Amino acid sequence: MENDKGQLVELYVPRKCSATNRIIKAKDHASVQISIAKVDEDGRAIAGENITYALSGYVRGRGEADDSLNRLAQQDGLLKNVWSYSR
Amino acid sequence: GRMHSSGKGISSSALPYSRNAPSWFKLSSDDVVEQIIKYARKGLTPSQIGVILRDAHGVSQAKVVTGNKILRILKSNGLAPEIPEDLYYLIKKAVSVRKHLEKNRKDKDSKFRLILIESRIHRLARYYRTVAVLPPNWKYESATASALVA
Amino acid sequence: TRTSVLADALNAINNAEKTGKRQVLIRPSSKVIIKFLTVMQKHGYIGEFEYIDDHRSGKIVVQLNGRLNKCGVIQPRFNVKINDIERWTDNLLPARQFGYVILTTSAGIMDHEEARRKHVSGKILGFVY
Amino acid sequence: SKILSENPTELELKVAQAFVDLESQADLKAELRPLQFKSIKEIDVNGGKKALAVFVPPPSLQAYRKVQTRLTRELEKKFPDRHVVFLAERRILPKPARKARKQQKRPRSRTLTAVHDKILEDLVFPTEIIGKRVRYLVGGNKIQKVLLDSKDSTAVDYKLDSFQQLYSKLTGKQVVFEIPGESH
Amino acid sequence: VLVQDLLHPSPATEAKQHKLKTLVQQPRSFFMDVKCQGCLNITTVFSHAQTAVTCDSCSTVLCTPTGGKAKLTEGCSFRRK
Amino acid sequence: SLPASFDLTPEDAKLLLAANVHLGAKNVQVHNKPYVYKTRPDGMNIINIGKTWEKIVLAARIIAAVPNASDVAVCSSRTFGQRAVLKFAAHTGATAIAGRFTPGNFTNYITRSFKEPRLVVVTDPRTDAQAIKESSYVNIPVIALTDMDSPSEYVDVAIPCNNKGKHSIGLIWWLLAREVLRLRGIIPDRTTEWSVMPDLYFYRDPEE
RNA sequence: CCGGGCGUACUGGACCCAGCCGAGCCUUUCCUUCUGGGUAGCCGAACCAGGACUUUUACUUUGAAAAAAUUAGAGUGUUCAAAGCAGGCCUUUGCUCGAAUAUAUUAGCAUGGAAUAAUAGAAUAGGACGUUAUGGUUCU
Ligand SMILES: [Mg+2]
Ligand SMILES: [Mg+2]
Ligand SMILES: [Mg+2]
Ligand SMILES: [Mg+2]
Ligand SMILES: [Mg+2]
Ligand SMILES: [Mg+2]
Ligand SMILES: [Mg+2]
Ligand SMILES: [Mg+2]
Ligand SMILES: [Zn+2]
């Protein structure tokens, strides 16, 4: 959100859930931010270099967070043939 | 669902997606028609002809073979009954209940069921008059019902 | 019985979107449902949707992307004059800068902003934001 | 005489010349005397091939269907690098306007939806359609998908791409043919 | 399950569904070619037949109707068409 | 994606089946259905250990992303897992919580063992419900070793395994410790045999 | 895109990116017409003006109509204001802006459109076209 002259009058552009695209509120204390390390070709974890996902507290409360990570990580190559689109 | 009950059953037939005759079907559109007329003269209603066709002749649907529905073929050959089959069986059941009621006067359950059947007759007979299947002056009479079906 | 297939379709979409699902199955289909979905798709509130032909009224599978706050019908489809469109957008939309009231006009199904552009009005059909 | 049109083109004559040659073998001769066609529409498809559309009077369609499987195979031999299909010349009646003068009620077989579905059925004749789907892409365009039965698949399995462009030429809309139940 | 392919259900789970609850409803019944033991005559019989079908040659009942599928008599072999 | 050296090796697969890791509970909840390969005719559900292996690798990569190793908390209320979490903390530098979890350890900031972990790892969602519940109050992601009957509420990464096995618990913890050290570079490569034996991390009765 | 104090209105100049409101033509898609103009190009639409027919609505756009006063509202130093429809000019043997404009709304009228919701049609065919198809029976 910005005014007519173009300045971003918005403070706190919030984060969004990686699974459901809901806005994660400032006091949503059930929301987490998963940080997953990148691994080089030697099998070593690369220091300070991560793939990051965010989940709203709503998704975690229903117990669908585990199945959502299976899907999200498989699309990014972090996993193979563990989550199936067709059930 | 179930106009005259509290039931919610969904059992019915599920027509296949294919609207064409099966590849293994060899009878012609004519041979089915003469088969239908042959069975129609034995007194079968369109429901019973269709049951016999799939049960004993492999005719999955008369429409996918001949091109017309079964009642449409009978009406095209002057073999359509005067009373539609479903209205006939409702009146016949009402006749059976009314005959049972005069000998069992304390059967208040049969009196309740008879009202349902007759209410079902009037709704259906009223529809048939708007579509000009029945004459506009056609009326169901309980006294003279036995003549129509017996 | 089933008196409004559009109401059934939008209710299913709302229930799937509120529950975080990214897809929903709609039965039965119709022209009004498809043209209503196209308006939602045009403004980005839904993704691609797919029509399945079953030699019947049909079925639709819609992909949801989480941007949809609420879509709904207005039953009955009230007659709306051009001077009445402003009053309807005030009651149904969260703000004056986004959201759309869907109308059925003789020029076709369109949002309230497009209706002002082509200067047409019809019956109100629904909303989306 | 095989051509039901006045001033046939050279291609129509050549095709009718083939039609007066396949009855030489008596296995299929008792039926090629009455067979006639109205036009031969030909378009160019990618890959160096050319699509050949034989247009047939709709009442005569069921006679062609009895020998079409064989007849195409030899017609593809006589004309190499040609994909041969048989279509019936169905008539499309325009939707009446509100102010239009009253005519006879338009039968459904004459509607544009029925005819495009009908030519979509004549395109894949040896196989039968077991399902149709329509995708509505975010861009605005719409794509049909037609699913074909695996039975008699070998008659069309090397084409299908000719059908998609041919259907696009006739109607202007996009379709994609898929056979979900192949061996693969 | 929030994300799921509704357009391509697993064919195993698709077959356990009720006949009206598939993507496109489809009957699970079929037609059969019935060989009675006494003779050899093709007779097309519906799987869920409601009639006591008899073959043309000899007036012997081939099947008896039941609540669901018709029950073939002893010595009768069926082949799905 | 991932190098092929990270694939499930036959040696680890032999360990998982011999430790009865693949035995999942009789009744499976709807959220754990994708992890079931087939139901055994007695009633036990067979765990797709190929999926189990990949979740282990994914879980170890999240642990390796925490800068301070002590900020990772490993928990076990079951007696079968108490020895495993204590040795995991020793090898990896994590903070073990064996036995009773004092309610308020994450929310009550005046308790004795008041911790602020960036990540909580749980042996069983059912018997460690208290530890999982408070993590949902202070934005703590949860990795859990889940059986087919284990609840999946507020669990982000689920490791499908047998929670009610003496050897299953110890083996899964041993595998995580080895992989975390491999990513950190403590283990030189993915083929070198680790000095520690899976017998360590196994619960011992007072008899011995 | 020379903007000749963000200015930036004005406006020479867009060369229009895309977008938006249109109009026709072609895709199997044409007021069946009737009478001229009138005939120009083939071997009556080539646009008007004068006739002949027409499934019924609902809905929505636009227009005329819905008296003045009242309401909203433009202008105007009644000394301000409530009001009023006055008034202003170098001082006038007179010159001269005005007294707007919106709103009405069910019913009726004319009009564009044809989504939505109804309605009628070809089933014992007593169905449609033959523009110059062939006769017959009546009627003006
Ligand atoms: Mg029901
Ligand atoms: Mg009722
Ligand atoms: Mg039924
Ligand atoms: Mg968009
Ligand atoms: Mg309100
Ligand atoms: Mg708005
Ligand atoms: Mg929005
Ligand atoms: Mg011969
Ligand atoms: Zn026999």
Alpha carbon of D7 to ligand 2 centroid (Å): 67
Do C73 and C124 meet the contact criterion of CB atoms below 8 Å apart?
no
Residues of chain A positioned with their CB less than 8 A from the CB of C22: 20
Q: How far out from the chain centre does Cα B30 lie?
A: 24
What angle (nearest 5°) sits at the alpha carbon of residue D29, between those of residues D23 and D30?
A: 155
Do C52 and C34 meet the contact criterion of CB atoms below 8 Å apart?
no
Q: Is the CB of D104 under 7 A from strand G?
A: yes
Q: How far apart are CA F166 and CA F178, in angstroms?
A: 19
Shortest distance between the Cα of A68 and any Cα of chain E, in A, equals 8
Identify the residue among C15, C17, C19 best suited for mutation to test binding to A, counting A beta carbons within 10 A and taking the highest.
Answer: C19
Do C7 and C75 meet the contact criterion of CB atoms below 8 Å apart?
yes
Which of left, alpha, beta for C66 (phi over 0: left; psi -120 to 50: alpha)?
left
Alpha-carbon torsion angle F60, F63, F67, F72, nearest 10? -140
Q: How far apart are CA B84 and CA B46, in angstroms?
A: 10
Is the Cβ pair D131, B23 closer than 8 Å?
A: no
Protein-to-nucleotide distance from the CA of F9 to the C1' of G62, whole angstroms: 80
Alpha carbon of B7 to ligand 3 centroid (Å): 15
What angle (nearest 5°) sits at the alpha carbon of residue C79, between those of residues C76 and C83?
A: 135
| DSSP string covering chain D | --B-SSS--HHHHHHHHHHTTTTSSGGG-TTTTT--BSEEEEEE-TTS-EEEEEEE-GGGHHHHTTTHHHHHHHHHHHSTTEEEEEEE-PPPPPPPPSSSPP-SPPPGGGSHHHHHHHHHHHTTTTS-EEEEEEEE-TTS-EEEEEEE-STTGGGTTT-SHHHHHHHHHHHS-EEEEE-TT---
Protein-to-nucleotide distance from the CA of F37 to the C1' of G137, whole angstroms: 90
The structure tokens 């007194």 sit at: B43
Is the Cβ pair C66, A21 closer than 8 Å?
A: yes
Identify the residue among D125, D128, D149, D151 best suited for mutation to test binding to B, counting B beta carbons within 10 A and taking the highest.
Answer: D128
Is the Cβ pair A87, E3 closer than 8 Å?
A: no
Do A24 and A14 meet the contact criterion of CB atoms below 8 Å apart?
yes
Residues of chain A positioned with their CB less than 8 A from the CB of C67: 21
Shortest distance between the Cα of C33 and any Cα of chain B, in A, equals 23
Q: What is the resolution of this structure in A?
A: 3.0
Q: Which residues, at least 6 apart from F105, have a Cβ–Cβ distance to it below 8 Å? A: F97, F111, F113, F114, F115, F134
The number of the ligand nearest the C-alpha atom of B12 reads 3
Q: How far apart are CA C87 and CA C78, in angstroms?
A: 13
Protein-to-nucleotide distance from the CA of C82 to the C1' of G24, whole angstroms: 29
List, as ranges, residues 4-23 from B with C-beta within 8 Å of C.
15, 17, 19
Q: How far apart are CA B46 and CA B42, in angstroms?
A: 12
Token pair for residue D163?
């059908």
- In this complex, the chains that touch A, judged by 3 or more CB pairs closer than 8 A, are C, E, F
The strand ranges marked E within E1-81 are: 31-35, 44-46, 63-64, 71-72, 77-80
Alpha carbon of C68 to ligand 7 centroid (Å): 6
Which of A54, A53, A87, A82 has the alpha carbon at shortest distance from A70? A82
Q: How far apart are CA D66 and CA D54, in angstroms?
A: 16
Burial tier of B51 (Cβ tally within 10 Å: 0-12, 13-18, 19+): middle
User: Which residues in window 150-179 of D are less than 7 A from strand G by Cβ?
Assistant: 172
* Residue among E2, E9, E13 minimizing CB distance to A19: E2
Which of F108, F115, F87, F111 has the alpha carbon at shortest distance from F174? F87
**If DSSP codes are grouped into helix, strand and coil, which group holds residue F77?**
coil
Any E CB within 8 A of B19 CB: no
Which of D161, D166, D171, D132 has the alpha carbon at shortest distance from D149? D132
User: Which residues in window 78-97 of C are less than 7 A from strand G by Cβ?
Assistant: 79-83
Nearest DNA or RNA nucleotide to D110 (CA to C1'): G28
Protein-to-nucleotide distance from the CA of C118 to the C1' of G71, whole angstroms: 32
The structure tokens 């939806």 sit at: D113
| CA closest to G114 C1', residue | C106
Any B CB within 8 A of C54 CB: yes
Q: How far apart are CA F174 and CA C69, in angstroms?
A: 46
Q: How far apart are CA D113 and CA A42, in angstroms?
A: 61
Identify the residue among C1, C55, C59 best suited for mutation to test binding to B, counting B beta carbons within 10 A and taking the highest.
Answer: C55
Q: Do chains E and A touch (3 or more CB pairs under 8 A)?
A: yes
Q: How far apart are CA F124 and CA F147, in angstroms?
A: 8
For residue E58, say whether it is annotated as part of any ligand binding site. Answer: yes
Any C CB within 8 A of D138 CB: yes
Q: Is the CB of C2 under 7 A from strand G?
A: no
Do E29 and E48 meet the contact criterion of CB atoms below 8 Å apart?
yes
Token pair for residue D109?
């077989």
Strands C59-63 and C23-26: antiparallel
Nearest DNA or RNA nucleotide to C35 (CA to C1'): G115
Alpha-carbon torsion angle E55, E58, E59, E62, nearest 10? -40
Helices and strands: H and E segment counts in chain B: 7, 0
Q: How far apart are CA B22 and CA F132, in angstroms?
A: 60
Protein-to-nucleotide distance from the CA of C38 to the C1' of G1, whole angstroms: 39
Q: Is the CB of D89 under 7 A from strand G?
A: yes
Q: Is the CB of C66 under 7 A from strand G?
A: no
A70 φ, ψ (degrees, to nearest 5): -55, -45
Q: How far apart are CA B142 and CA E6, in angstroms?
A: 54
Do B120 and B93 meet the contact criterion of CB atoms below 8 Å apart?
no
Helix (H) or strand (E) run with residue E14 in it: helix E11-16
Q: How many CB pairs under 8 A join A and C?
A: 14
CA atoms within 13 A on the CB side of E46: 24
Nearest DNA or RNA nucleotide to C109 (CA to C1'): G115
- The protein footprint on chain G, as nucleotides within 7 A of a CB, is 20-22, 27-32, 53-55, 57, 59-62, 104, 106, 112-117, 120-122, 127-128
Burial tier of F36 (Cβ tally within 10 Å: 0-12, 13-18, 19+): middle
Shortest distance between the Cα of D95 and any Cα of chain B, in A, equals 25
The amino acid that residue C3 corresponds to is T
Q: How far apart are CA D113 and CA C53, in angstroms?
A: 13
